[PDB]
Design an enzyme around this catalytic site. Structure first.
Site, PDB file in Angstrom:
ATOM      1  N   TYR C  27      57.696   9.708 -12.535  1.00 52.36           N
ATOM      2  CA  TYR C  27      59.100   9.653 -12.883  1.00 52.36           C
ATOM      3  C   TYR C  27      59.476   8.842 -14.108  1.00 52.36           C
ATOM      4  CZ  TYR C  27      60.382  12.257  -8.762  1.00 52.36           C
ATOM      5  OH  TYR C  27      60.519  13.282  -7.862  1.00 52.36           O
ATOM      6  N   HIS C  47      66.168   4.967 -11.112  1.00 55.04           N
ATOM      7  CA  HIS C  47      66.841   4.904 -12.399  1.00 55.04           C
ATOM      8  C   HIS C  47      67.221   6.318 -12.843  1.00 55.04           C
ATOM      9  CE1 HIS C  47      66.850   4.514 -16.927  1.00 55.04           C
ATOM     10  NE2 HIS C  47      67.581   3.462 -16.603  1.00 55.04           N
ATOM     11  N   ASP C  89      70.105   0.493 -16.106  1.00 53.86           N
ATOM     12  CA  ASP C  89      69.012  -0.116 -16.843  1.00 53.86           C
ATOM     13  C   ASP C  89      68.672  -1.504 -16.305  1.00 53.86           C
ATOM     14  OD1 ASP C  89      69.599   2.135 -18.292  1.00 53.86           O
ATOM     15  OD2 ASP C  89      69.644   1.115 -20.238  1.00 53.86           O
TER      16      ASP C  89
END
Ligand SMILES: CCCCCCCCO[C@@H]1O[C@H](CO)[C@@H](O)[C@H](O)[C@H]1O
Ligand SMILES: CCCCCCCCO[C@@H]1O[C@H](CO)[C@@H](O)[C@H](O)[C@H]1O
Lengths: 122, 122, 122, 122
Positions: C27, C47, C89
């Protein structure tokens, strides 16, 4: 050092090197194979030939000294090896700048499996 | 063709080539850089040198004819180029088989960024 | 912006993101497929799910404002979208930091063809 | 199996699948992200949606049985799962064939980083 090279390309090109050049064509990525895809890729082919000529030090991880005297990169130091690799980088960054006009997005992140089987010689 | 090469490696090695050799060391993946990590990686380095000598045809995508006459791969055909690439493959598969004993899992899927800066010459 | 994300990961992890995380597992690279390989890979899976929820702006190329108030990343600005992606993030970088202990080199540069056929859902 | 899928695309398209479709657009490569670049890319997007619906078996590595009865691929077998994935493949190969006219070389080997942040839903 590649991190210094990266700063040269950024200033002379205006692009993020890691995104725009780290995986471009057949030679800009790590190593290199086949025939250069275009002008920009030729810059990397030549830079590759440049690093191979370097014998006394590590072009990839050795730090060299340079400055931007008058908008142009100037390589200094007393170490001829590190200065030697600094010139390899300086020339590549300028090579990217001159051929920016022929830069093709279809070539960044180009799959190496698609590169010619017979590689060009330095 | 790489899909024929794959069948040779499988039969002579007993391993799935795509998983066990497609990303091994510094030379088995696409292209190649630095110094071969080990014996198996040297097989790929030599195979790489082999495909570079081939001029008349495409070693990667050209189909060649071969047979398993007596448990050994036998390359045939009237085309010297395709047969030439068949021998490159035959030799590599046998090279993998002979060095199976030194095969290291830590080397499959090896990151190319960690490969030496100065590449060995053919 | 990915270049800001990169600075967060570097400071919180001490590793070069482009080398150590840009191609990790199934990923962390571009997109993602199958089942996360490990903890670090799960950071990227989450994320990924985070960026998909962002609607008003571009998580990849939009710049957001943040600061390192007290060794911790602090996302600011009046734009809820850009701040939204800043949190995605921030969370990922901290996720990498917490699972650094389980980081496996065999997983960086992991071949996507080897990723499971059935992908986990966000 | 992807190697059977590859044979379907080759016969129906006349192109080497590994070179022409394995890295095309945003969905043909492994996984997929953003919005399909074009018609061909949509073929892969749909095929991706197809493999996700398959539950009983492995669409990627499971072998299915099929034949070319009258220039057309015919999927057989008693296994509804493997036949299910055979139809996913059969449909994709035909999809590539029908949209060959809109195939763009600039899209093969397309960099995934350039793919939209918001992915289309199946
Ligand atoms: C998750 C950490 C992200 C750090 C920034 C990484 C920027 C480079 O990102 C990489 O770009 C390549 C081509 O450009 C793609 O092939 C890779 O999939 C992608 O990860
Ligand atoms: C080595 C065999 C490659 C066969 C050509 C496949 C053409 C692109 O096909 C894609 O392949 C992916 C893996 O790369 C699969 O995950 C996807 O199901 C498929 O869309």
């Amino acid at each position: 050092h590649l991190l210094q090279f990266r700063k040269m390309i950024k200033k002379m090109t205006g692009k993020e090197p890691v995104v725009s050049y780290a995986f471009y064509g057949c030679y800009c990525g790590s190593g290199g194979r086949g025939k250069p895809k275009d002008a920009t890729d030729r810059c990397c082919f030549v830079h590759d030939c440049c690093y191979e000529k370097v014998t006394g030090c590590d072009p990839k991880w050795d730090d060299y000294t340079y400055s931007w005297k008058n908008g142009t990169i100037v390589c200094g130091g007393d170490d001829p090896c590190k200065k030697e690799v600094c010139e390899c980088d300086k020339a590549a960054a300028i090579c990217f700048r001159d051929n920016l006009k022929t830069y093709k997005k279809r070539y960044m992140a180009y799959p190496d499996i698609l590169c010619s089987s017979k590689s060009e010689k330095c």
